[PDB]
Amino acid sequence: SGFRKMAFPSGKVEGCMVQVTCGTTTLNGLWLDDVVYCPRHVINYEDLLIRKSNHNFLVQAGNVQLRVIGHSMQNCVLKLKVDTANPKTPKYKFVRIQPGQTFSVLACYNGSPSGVYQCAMRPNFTIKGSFLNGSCGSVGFNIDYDCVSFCYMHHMELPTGVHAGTDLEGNFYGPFVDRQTAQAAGTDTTITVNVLAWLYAAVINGDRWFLNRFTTTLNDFNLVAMKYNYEPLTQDHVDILGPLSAQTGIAVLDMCASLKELLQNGMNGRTILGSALLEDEFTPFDVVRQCSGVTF
Amino acid sequence: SGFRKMAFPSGKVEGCMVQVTCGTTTLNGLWLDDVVYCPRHVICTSEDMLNPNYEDLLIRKSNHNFLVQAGNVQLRVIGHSMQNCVLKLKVDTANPKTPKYKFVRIQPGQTFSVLACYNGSPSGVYQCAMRPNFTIKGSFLNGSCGSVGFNIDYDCVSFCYMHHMELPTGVHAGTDLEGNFYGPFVDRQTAQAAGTDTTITVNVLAWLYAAVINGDRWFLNRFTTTLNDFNLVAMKYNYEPLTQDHVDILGPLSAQTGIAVLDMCASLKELLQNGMNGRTILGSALLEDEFTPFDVVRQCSGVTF
Ligand SMILES: O=C(Cc1cccc(Cl)c1)Nc1cncc2cc(C(=O)O)ccc12
Ligand SMILES: O=C(Cc1cccc(Cl)c1)Nc1cncc2cc(C(=O)O)ccc12
Ligand SMILES: [Cl-]
């Protein structure tokens, strides 16, 4: 029993964190094999990069200085070739996630990991993270079996306190650019398929007060979702919730009618899994994994 | 900017997790140097749990009855002893991944990270607090016994909790790493119930100071309170009494924001009376009590927005 916001064990990622310094800027880098990946804002980026030589980049792994032997740019990420391959390099892939998908963030300062937390890529492509100055280059990841899938690298904080970054190939999530300009996050929406997954997790843990005898259609529900700034629920979302529906005996559109009533009436002083708000940062897979005990 | 429930990086603890098997029971162990620490209930059957005599059950065991697995390698058990509710298994290999560590016993209200494990394999990490009733609201399934709670301050891992059991309400009970339980609990299948739980007042205050640091002041008011008047009201909402020690501990956060502890106590009194009126504080519609004053200072910026 119990339901917590749970991150993947960060050990395989901790062994890759390094400190990168260029001039007065100090941020974090990801050391995989003989390459260190970091935000290019550490340095017209091509014009600024041509003026830098290998010895201008200071890379520190723990108490050891790594020797930079090459440098190249891929989109908004700088790739620093080093002389030493990271002996702690785990099995890994670079993956681009979609809004609604969750991941763990290992927040770092000066190449030293300070905390790990779980979060979701919002529909507006921002992340509601917890980052201070020096956190740039901190990474987001998932673990599947023994393989680390790197999906995010932190680049910047927006005026509202939300965060923006790129995949590990340097492509931003969202209509953001790596520069100090008037940039604002778009209006955000609630991740509907994730709220439904979290309602199934509540039923599994013995919280059934919000269940009712009613069912609905995808059409009727999507009109309600549009009214309360909820993302549209697709037939793919319904299919993905199939296993949880089979386990609890509550059809996905039966649970949609429960969510419709919660949106139109509130919780009436009650909570669901110790929360007075509808939680949308657990995917259907997260709910199944946490309510099964999958290890890494 | 931002405020999240944050756990310590679990790497230093992952390198210590092993699987311990005794007969049909399989649970987790903590391998530090040449000793593996695990719940002593690993020697019990389900039947034994009603009234187990652990000394009688242990004297019948030999070293080779305990199977210890670290990754894909079998560790050889060369000794065994019991210390309170923990079994200490001497092994023939010191853990090369042993971090710098201490065993610390925490008090209610203190927070820590939990590395949840099954079969000596870590599956997840989360942050939680030792409740005033000495239970933890964790997330554990069968096989999680032996999972540990810890804090990492600088490069030293302070182990403070080892998971032993789940209570009828779904809450969890366990021991420090010397085998002493937190709370009036026993590692026995008997009628045990958690005492009535209360809100950790000093932690809710710390979290209200974190909200002010991140730019939110809607809940502040022009009032103050005496410490005794605050406690007479707070105890009516099942809040723990605030002591002079708690007021002293909140001193740095009071100095940083310019809001006296007893003025923050007045905002809390008003919040309890009125509710939030559709508003949130740090993205939450409830008053959060699982961040200590120390956690807030660690996670927040030294410059108030
Ligand atoms: O956004 C920047 C710098 C920057 C500026 C223009 C373009 C780019 Cl790509 C990057 N840095 C920060 C990233 N994350 C959290 C941050 C918290 C703080 C803070 O809490 O003080 C300050 C800076 C923070
Ligand atoms: O409590 C026990 C075994 C036990 C029994 C009587 C006394 C003691 Cl000391 C220990 N094991 C479990 C520990 N944690 C979470 C657990 C969740 C579940 C569950 O959710 O199914 C089951 C068992 C769980
Ligand atoms: Cl303590």
XYZ file of C-alpha atoms and ligand atoms in Angstrom:
650
model
C 0.000 0.000 0.000
C 0.820 3.695 -0.413
C 1.166 5.963 -3.437
C 4.086 8.309 -3.775
C 5.595 10.429 -6.519
C 8.490 8.121 -7.285
C 11.642 8.720 -9.245
C 13.896 6.086 -10.838
C 17.057 5.221 -8.828
C 19.597 7.887 -10.001
C 22.872 5.937 -9.554
C 23.508 5.170 -13.246
C 23.097 8.912 -14.021
C 25.160 10.185 -11.024
C 28.245 8.417 -12.483
C 27.894 10.608 -15.649
C 27.611 14.099 -14.076
C 30.543 16.485 -14.630
C 31.196 20.252 -14.221
C 31.823 22.328 -17.371
C 33.413 25.805 -17.189
C 33.925 28.260 -20.006
C 35.121 31.688 -18.984
C 32.887 32.850 -16.162
C 30.003 30.364 -16.811
C 29.877 27.109 -14.819
C 27.192 24.474 -15.537
C 26.644 20.665 -15.684
C 27.647 18.179 -18.369
C 26.727 14.568 -19.165
C 29.828 12.378 -19.706
C 28.993 9.314 -21.835
C 31.927 7.316 -23.343
C 34.466 9.992 -24.565
C 31.893 12.829 -25.075
C 30.574 15.468 -22.626
C 27.142 16.887 -23.573
C 26.101 20.295 -22.191
C 23.916 23.376 -23.136
C 25.651 25.407 -25.849
C 24.874 28.634 -23.876
C 27.996 27.767 -21.773
C 30.047 29.409 -24.655
C 25.455 33.508 -33.304
C 26.642 30.394 -31.523
C 28.762 29.161 -34.494
C 30.625 32.518 -34.523
C 31.258 32.280 -30.753
C 32.335 28.584 -30.945
C 34.943 29.168 -33.685
C 36.703 31.686 -31.343
C 37.031 29.006 -28.596
C 39.765 26.407 -28.489
C 39.709 23.018 -26.703
C 41.698 24.288 -23.658
C 39.095 27.061 -23.056
C 36.621 24.358 -21.864
C 37.399 23.150 -18.330
C 35.799 19.771 -17.564
C 35.890 18.358 -14.043
C 34.774 14.810 -13.139
C 34.860 14.585 -9.324
C 38.379 15.696 -8.393
C 39.847 14.841 -11.851
C 40.307 17.271 -14.728
C 39.305 15.813 -18.132
C 41.238 16.914 -21.241
C 39.075 18.370 -24.047
C 40.404 17.164 -27.463
C 37.526 18.327 -29.729
C 34.276 20.315 -29.799
C 31.194 20.387 -32.004
C 27.606 21.634 -31.861
C 24.394 19.718 -32.521
C 21.336 21.997 -32.389
C 21.369 23.627 -28.845
C 23.831 21.074 -27.305
C 27.625 21.326 -27.258
C 29.541 18.022 -27.571
C 32.991 18.065 -25.976
C 35.282 15.246 -27.060
C 37.459 14.208 -24.095
C 40.566 11.957 -23.923
C 39.080 9.587 -21.334
C 36.038 7.369 -21.818
C 33.732 7.335 -18.751
C 34.269 3.921 -17.138
C 30.887 4.380 -15.384
C 28.994 4.790 -18.722
C 25.730 2.860 -18.417
C 23.775 1.215 -21.259
C 21.876 4.229 -22.744
C 19.705 5.706 -25.543
C 18.734 9.308 -26.345
C 14.912 9.457 -26.593
C 12.552 12.364 -27.299
C 9.434 12.241 -25.096
C 5.906 13.576 -25.788
C 3.843 15.926 -23.528
C 2.158 13.917 -20.758
C 5.112 11.522 -20.420
C 6.964 11.539 -17.076
C 10.669 11.287 -16.177
C 13.127 11.639 -13.302
C 15.347 14.683 -12.975
C 18.742 14.542 -11.294
C 19.254 18.211 -10.258
C 23.021 19.112 -10.183
C 25.210 22.115 -9.292
C 28.934 22.194 -10.154
C 28.737 18.646 -11.579
C 27.529 17.400 -8.179
C 24.045 15.816 -7.890
C 21.955 17.323 -5.098
C 18.485 15.853 -5.575
C 16.223 13.626 -7.590
C 12.573 14.267 -8.383
C 9.843 13.036 -10.711
C 8.013 15.298 -13.148
C 6.024 15.408 -16.392
C 6.463 17.162 -19.713
C 3.481 19.575 -19.630
C 1.198 19.969 -22.717
C 2.779 23.505 -23.090
C 6.229 21.757 -23.254
C 7.487 23.250 -19.995
C 8.368 21.316 -16.831
C 7.404 22.480 -13.323
C 10.845 21.730 -11.880
C 12.893 22.922 -8.942
C 16.054 24.531 -10.202
C 18.361 27.307 -8.997
C 21.253 29.104 -10.821
C 23.901 26.529 -11.788
C 21.355 23.755 -12.495
C 21.729 24.133 -16.343
C 22.826 20.835 -17.874
C 20.874 18.739 -15.262
C 19.200 15.780 -17.035
C 15.851 13.973 -17.256
C 15.695 10.204 -17.733
C 13.730 6.976 -17.509
C 15.095 3.459 -16.930
C 13.816 0.474 -18.894
C 15.367 -2.781 -17.683
C 19.102 -1.800 -17.372
C 19.068 0.942 -20.099
C 18.958 4.642 -19.217
C 16.845 6.620 -21.717
C 18.013 10.269 -21.526
C 15.125 12.531 -22.549
C 15.810 16.032 -21.195
C 18.614 18.523 -20.522
C 17.829 21.697 -18.567
C 18.577 25.017 -20.308
C 16.488 27.823 -18.792
C 13.852 29.194 -16.425
C 10.887 31.174 -17.796
C 9.392 34.312 -16.081
C 6.612 32.275 -14.401
C 9.147 29.985 -12.656
C 8.631 27.048 -15.063
C 11.490 25.352 -16.937
C 12.491 24.795 -20.541
C 15.048 22.498 -22.108
C 15.998 20.153 -24.938
C 16.217 16.437 -25.765
C 19.884 15.110 -25.778
C 20.126 15.876 -29.537
C 19.695 19.620 -28.641
C 16.151 20.077 -29.970
C 14.013 22.166 -27.590
C 10.715 20.952 -26.253
C 8.341 23.839 -27.051
C 8.616 27.102 -28.980
C 11.605 28.244 -26.952
C 15.030 29.586 -27.923
C 18.283 29.612 -25.883
C 18.584 33.377 -25.410
C 17.357 36.173 -23.161
C 14.248 37.359 -24.991
C 10.524 37.821 -24.242
C 9.450 34.183 -24.015
C 6.363 32.962 -22.209
C 4.874 29.518 -21.643
C 1.586 28.962 -23.406
C -1.643 28.360 -21.447
C -1.300 24.940 -19.792
C -3.787 22.071 -19.755
C -4.358 19.039 -17.500
C -3.105 15.660 -18.746
C -6.449 13.754 -18.787
C -5.115 10.202 -19.382
C -2.760 10.708 -16.360
C -5.601 11.961 -14.045
C -7.590 8.829 -15.046
C -4.575 6.560 -14.275
C -4.269 8.248 -10.832
C -8.034 7.671 -10.186
C -7.427 3.948 -10.996
C -4.449 3.991 -8.537
C -6.789 5.424 -5.854
C -9.294 2.598 -6.445
C -6.478 0.011 -6.187
C -5.441 1.572 -2.829
C -9.056 1.472 -1.484
C -10.407 5.037 -2.238
C -13.842 4.531 -4.011
C -16.029 7.446 -2.828
C -15.914 9.106 -6.309
C -17.165 6.019 -8.177
C -20.705 6.198 -9.513
C -23.094 3.959 -11.546
C -22.833 6.169 -14.646
C -20.960 5.798 -17.912
C -20.389 8.280 -20.772
C -19.218 8.610 -24.398
C -15.815 9.852 -25.640
C -17.733 12.694 -27.414
C -19.695 13.841 -24.317
C -16.631 13.613 -22.093
C -14.357 15.525 -24.540
C -16.822 18.481 -24.483
C -16.477 18.549 -20.638
C -12.660 18.190 -20.864
C -12.476 21.179 -23.292
C -14.531 23.272 -20.830
C -12.182 22.628 -17.850
C -8.812 23.071 -19.728
C -8.244 19.300 -19.853
C -6.418 17.747 -22.798
C -8.665 15.760 -25.204
C -8.911 12.041 -24.421
C -8.269 9.930 -27.522
C -9.169 6.287 -28.315
C -5.426 5.564 -27.839
C -5.679 6.813 -24.237
C -8.723 4.557 -23.670
C -6.779 1.547 -25.063
C -3.718 2.357 -22.893
C -5.996 2.420 -19.771
C -7.368 -1.081 -20.667
C -5.236 -3.092 -18.199
C -6.171 -0.801 -15.233
C -9.851 -0.988 -16.272
C -9.669 -4.816 -16.336
C -7.924 -4.967 -12.913
C -10.452 -2.749 -11.074
C -13.629 -3.625 -13.026
C -14.293 0.042 -13.903
C -14.570 0.751 -17.659
C -12.602 3.796 -18.882
C -15.818 5.723 -19.802
C -17.327 4.628 -16.405
C -14.240 6.348 -14.778
C -14.668 9.334 -17.185
C -18.154 9.900 -15.705
C -16.505 9.981 -12.201
C -14.010 12.598 -13.495
C -16.851 14.614 -15.105
C -18.640 14.726 -11.722
C -15.389 15.743 -9.938
C -14.845 18.573 -12.454
C -18.423 19.889 -12.140
C -18.796 19.463 -8.325
C -15.328 19.448 -6.786
C -14.230 17.082 -3.990
C -16.611 18.446 -1.255
C -13.935 18.535 1.471
C -12.664 15.058 0.560
C -9.233 13.937 -0.742
C -8.020 11.221 -3.160
C -4.644 9.668 -2.230
C -4.079 12.509 0.281
C -4.591 15.190 -2.385
C -7.347 17.873 -2.746
C -6.427 18.473 -6.431
C -6.632 16.054 -9.373
C -3.076 14.779 -9.937
C -1.829 14.506 -13.565
C 1.879 13.600 -13.249
C 1.530 9.773 -13.126
C 1.140 7.956 -16.458
C -0.839 4.697 -16.828
C 2.557 2.876 -16.971
C 3.780 4.611 -13.755
C 0.612 3.420 -11.957
C 1.088 -0.184 -13.137
C 4.833 -0.150 -12.304
C 4.371 1.271 -8.793
C 1.441 -1.083 -8.077
C 3.562 -4.165 -9.227
C 7.156 -3.573 -8.000
C 9.317 -3.507 -11.186
C 13.072 -3.291 -10.284
C 16.252 -1.873 -11.964
C 12.580 29.015 -8.647
C 10.141 26.171 -8.026
C 9.510 23.901 -5.063
C 9.425 20.137 -5.364
C 9.397 17.184 -3.000
C 12.984 16.130 -3.588
C 14.806 12.947 -2.650
C 18.584 12.576 -2.260
C 20.412 10.922 -5.194
C 20.187 7.171 -4.411
C 23.445 5.924 -6.032
C 25.464 5.535 -2.824
C 22.619 3.400 -1.375
C 21.971 1.337 -4.565
C 25.528 -0.053 -4.305
C 24.649 -1.501 -0.852
C 21.368 -3.326 -1.672
C 21.461 -7.143 -1.554
C 18.889 -9.980 -1.470
C 18.664 -12.129 1.697
C 16.954 -15.543 1.669
C 16.225 -17.825 4.600
C 14.098 -20.831 3.762
C 11.082 -19.590 1.835
C 11.391 -15.862 2.866
C 13.197 -13.430 0.556
C 13.776 -9.745 1.546
C 16.368 -6.926 1.220
C 19.637 -6.410 3.080
C 22.067 -3.502 3.483
C 25.688 -4.531 2.739
C 28.166 -2.177 4.467
C 31.833 -3.302 4.727
C 31.671 -7.077 5.632
C 28.196 -6.972 7.322
C 24.688 -7.381 5.818
C 21.905 -5.801 7.928
C 18.320 -7.040 7.470
C 15.002 -7.416 9.453
C 15.268 -10.368 11.849
C 11.764 -11.528 10.717
C 13.575 -13.126 7.712
C 14.017 -16.225 9.998
C 10.211 -16.496 10.594
C 7.399 -18.355 8.891
C 3.939 -16.585 8.743
C 2.846 -18.926 11.624
C 5.853 -17.819 13.769
C 4.789 -14.157 13.444
C 1.952 -14.388 16.031
C 4.389 -14.944 18.947
C 7.903 -15.451 17.501
C 10.708 -16.317 19.890
C 13.568 -14.969 17.744
C 16.303 -16.203 20.062
C 14.868 -19.765 19.854
C 14.516 -19.495 16.014
C 18.031 -18.036 15.540
C 19.915 -20.591 17.734
C 18.618 -23.290 15.286
C 20.220 -21.561 12.296
C 23.668 -21.977 10.850
C 25.621 -19.619 8.516
C 24.844 -21.675 5.380
C 21.063 -21.375 6.015
C 21.310 -17.641 5.022
C 21.632 -17.046 1.268
C 22.974 -13.584 0.368
C 23.000 -12.373 -3.238
C 24.739 -9.161 -4.416
C 23.812 -8.681 -8.084
C 24.708 -11.994 -9.736
C 27.269 -12.953 -7.024
C 26.581 -15.145 -4.005
C 28.170 -13.814 -0.785
C 29.402 -16.358 1.794
C 27.929 -15.918 5.314
C 30.672 -16.487 7.975
C 28.804 -15.267 11.099
C 25.429 -14.077 12.386
C 24.189 -12.079 15.341
C 21.031 -10.287 16.410
C 20.908 -6.690 17.627
C 17.373 -5.734 18.739
C 15.088 -6.336 15.633
C 17.947 -6.439 13.083
C 19.946 -9.481 12.002
C 23.641 -8.810 11.208
C 25.175 -11.265 8.750
C 28.968 -11.313 8.652
C 30.113 -12.005 5.070
C 33.552 -12.974 3.614
C 33.692 -9.982 1.209
C 33.724 -6.300 2.155
C 31.472 -4.182 -0.110
C 33.848 -2.225 -2.376
C 30.980 0.228 -3.010
C 30.624 1.056 0.746
C 30.086 4.801 1.022
C 31.062 7.013 3.971
C 28.175 6.381 6.414
C 26.661 6.791 9.920
C 23.639 5.174 11.601
C 21.377 7.957 12.948
C 18.085 7.678 14.879
C 15.667 10.423 13.735
C 12.806 12.163 15.601
C 9.184 12.609 14.342
C 8.933 15.454 11.849
C 12.323 14.593 10.283
C 12.393 13.771 6.568
C 14.394 11.202 4.594
C 14.643 9.460 1.235
C 13.519 5.873 0.795
C 15.056 3.548 -1.778
C 12.272 0.964 -2.283
C 13.753 -2.505 -3.234
C 12.477 -5.998 -4.148
C 14.853 -8.997 -4.358
C 17.845 -6.770 -3.577
C 17.017 -4.677 -6.685
C 16.112 -0.963 -6.285
C 12.903 0.040 -8.032
C 12.246 3.611 -6.929
C 13.176 6.534 -4.733
C 10.847 8.852 -2.826
C 10.933 11.452 -0.058
C 8.928 11.092 3.167
C 8.715 12.116 6.848
C 8.647 10.262 10.183
C 5.066 11.028 11.304
C 4.337 12.183 14.896
C 2.723 8.717 15.439
C 6.118 7.144 14.400
C 4.753 5.617 11.196
C 5.719 6.543 7.618
C 3.230 6.984 4.758
C 5.329 4.991 2.288
C 4.689 3.046 -0.879
C 5.680 -0.541 -0.306
C 4.516 -3.918 -1.616
C 5.349 -7.467 -0.369
C 9.127 -8.054 -0.680
C 10.001 -4.417 0.225
C 11.109 -5.389 3.806
C 14.702 -4.339 4.375
C 14.379 -1.216 2.101
C 16.148 1.744 3.768
C 15.621 5.417 4.607
C 18.542 7.841 4.457
C 19.800 11.407 4.203
C 23.020 12.410 2.424
C 24.605 15.514 3.855
C 27.804 16.339 1.955
C 29.389 12.919 1.010
C 28.162 10.905 4.076
C 25.067 8.687 3.960
C 23.128 8.774 7.262
C 20.990 5.600 7.422
C 17.939 6.267 9.613
C 15.290 3.689 8.742
C 14.844 0.042 7.710
C 11.398 -1.133 6.605
C 9.851 -3.998 8.601
C 6.056 -3.978 8.264
C 2.789 -2.563 6.988
C 0.036 -1.716 9.504
C -3.738 -2.339 8.861
C -4.303 1.272 7.702
C -1.661 0.987 4.947
C 1.008 2.941 6.855
C 4.508 1.604 7.504
C 6.604 0.781 10.553
C 10.293 0.061 10.916
C 13.491 0.465 12.918
C 16.673 2.539 13.028
C 19.805 0.609 11.777
C 20.514 -0.579 15.376
C 17.169 -2.517 15.247
C 15.189 -0.266 17.610
C 11.652 0.367 16.335
C 10.250 3.836 15.898
C 6.969 3.826 17.844
C 5.250 1.298 20.097
C 5.486 -1.396 17.423
C 6.718 -4.975 17.568
C 7.841 -7.294 14.718
C 4.908 -9.577 15.542
C 1.540 -10.250 13.869
C -0.588 -8.798 16.672
C -3.291 -6.124 17.070
C -1.197 -3.055 16.420
C -2.645 0.202 15.287
C -1.018 3.522 14.605
C -1.908 6.241 17.106
C -3.998 9.229 15.904
C -1.805 11.182 13.475
C -1.146 14.907 13.681
C 0.208 17.593 11.327
C 3.879 18.559 11.761
C 3.400 22.277 12.597
C 7.067 23.375 12.382
C 7.218 21.808 8.836
C 3.976 23.565 7.657
C 5.512 26.875 8.900
C 8.796 26.152 7.027
C 6.749 25.466 3.846
C 4.837 28.797 4.314
C 8.281 30.538 4.554
C 9.309 28.673 1.309
C 6.160 30.081 -0.380
C 7.100 33.633 0.701
C 10.672 33.086 -0.657
C 9.172 31.987 -4.003
C 6.992 35.189 -4.138
C 3.640 34.246 -2.575
C 2.156 36.343 0.220
C -1.659 36.136 -0.231
C -2.052 34.203 3.116
C -0.190 36.704 5.304
C -2.218 38.943 7.669
C -1.575 41.958 9.983
C -1.901 39.870 13.157
C 0.455 38.189 15.604
C -0.167 35.598 18.343
C 1.303 34.443 21.594
C 2.860 30.939 21.359
C 0.264 29.620 23.854
C -2.719 31.065 21.927
C -1.306 29.535 18.689
C -1.072 26.072 20.332
C -4.624 26.274 21.821
C -6.014 26.831 18.262
C -3.609 24.451 16.347
C -4.378 21.552 18.679
C -8.091 21.871 17.666
C -7.071 21.069 14.061
C -4.899 18.053 15.113
C -1.648 20.005 14.720
C 1.372 19.116 16.841
C 2.240 21.648 19.580
C 4.824 24.206 18.493
C 7.631 24.417 21.049
C 10.180 27.187 21.729
C 12.742 24.862 20.016
C 10.635 24.993 16.829
C 10.499 28.818 17.022
C 14.322 28.933 17.419
C 14.811 26.539 14.477
C 12.626 28.824 12.265
C 14.829 31.867 13.146
C 16.956 31.880 9.954
C 13.840 31.713 7.666
C 12.214 34.503 9.723
C 15.363 36.670 9.291
C 15.538 35.999 5.532
C 11.889 36.944 4.781
C 11.373 39.624 7.464
C 8.346 37.778 8.930
C 8.501 36.980 12.689
C 7.711 33.283 13.595
C 4.716 34.324 15.694
C 3.397 36.470 12.743
C 3.734 33.372 10.455
C 1.860 31.451 13.228
C -0.976 34.039 12.900
C -1.215 33.378 9.068
C -1.355 29.616 9.806
C -4.188 30.173 12.352
C -6.155 32.109 9.713
C -5.461 29.509 6.971
C -6.847 26.780 9.291
C -9.979 28.869 9.932
C -10.718 29.963 6.359
C -9.262 27.269 4.107
C -7.610 28.350 0.810
C -10.700 29.708 -1.040
C -9.784 28.101 -4.385
C -6.156 29.250 -4.101
C -2.979 27.158 -3.842
C 0.366 27.591 -2.077
C 3.319 26.188 -4.054
C 0.904 24.272 -6.318
C -0.821 22.580 -3.386
C -4.439 22.895 -2.092
C -3.512 21.331 1.303
C -1.012 22.538 3.937
C 2.188 20.537 3.337
C 4.066 19.138 6.358
C 6.809 16.915 4.847
C 9.498 19.655 4.374
C 11.609 20.542 7.401
C 13.106 24.002 8.047
C 16.493 22.482 6.947
C 14.962 21.095 3.676
C 13.548 24.563 2.857
C 16.919 26.268 3.411
C 18.633 23.572 1.268
C 16.185 23.733 -1.683
C 15.280 27.454 -1.771
C 17.404 30.374 -3.001
C 19.049 32.658 -0.414
C 17.429 35.658 -2.196
C 13.655 36.135 -1.541
C 11.550 36.960 -4.653
O 17.556 30.587 -17.392
C 18.708 30.638 -16.974
C 19.795 31.389 -17.719
C 19.480 31.586 -19.186
C 19.150 32.841 -19.681
C 18.844 33.017 -21.022
C 18.851 31.936 -21.889
C 19.175 30.693 -21.393
Cl 19.100 29.307 -22.447
C 19.503 30.504 -20.061
N 19.113 30.055 -15.827
C 18.344 29.305 -14.911
C 17.837 28.034 -15.174
N 17.080 27.316 -14.333
C 16.799 27.850 -13.155
C 17.238 29.127 -12.735
C 16.934 29.672 -11.467
C 17.407 30.903 -11.087
C 17.184 31.379 -9.694
O 16.325 30.870 -8.983
O 17.989 32.327 -9.283
C 18.169 31.660 -11.993
C 18.478 31.168 -13.230
C 18.034 29.884 -13.641
O 4.024 -6.557 6.733
C 4.697 -7.338 6.056
C 5.170 -8.671 6.599
C 5.078 -8.740 8.107
C 3.949 -9.260 8.729
C 3.815 -9.218 10.109
C 4.810 -8.652 10.890
C 5.946 -8.170 10.268
Cl 7.247 -7.539 11.239
C 6.093 -8.207 8.895
N 5.086 -7.083 4.792
C 4.941 -5.879 4.076
C 5.724 -4.746 4.297
N 5.551 -3.564 3.691
C 4.550 -3.457 2.828
C 3.662 -4.512 2.503
C 2.594 -4.371 1.589
C 1.787 -5.435 1.267
C 0.688 -5.256 0.273
O 0.323 -4.136 -0.095
O 0.179 -6.362 -0.200
C 2.020 -6.684 1.867
C 3.028 -6.850 2.771
C 3.879 -5.772 3.127
Cl 16.059 14.118 13.823
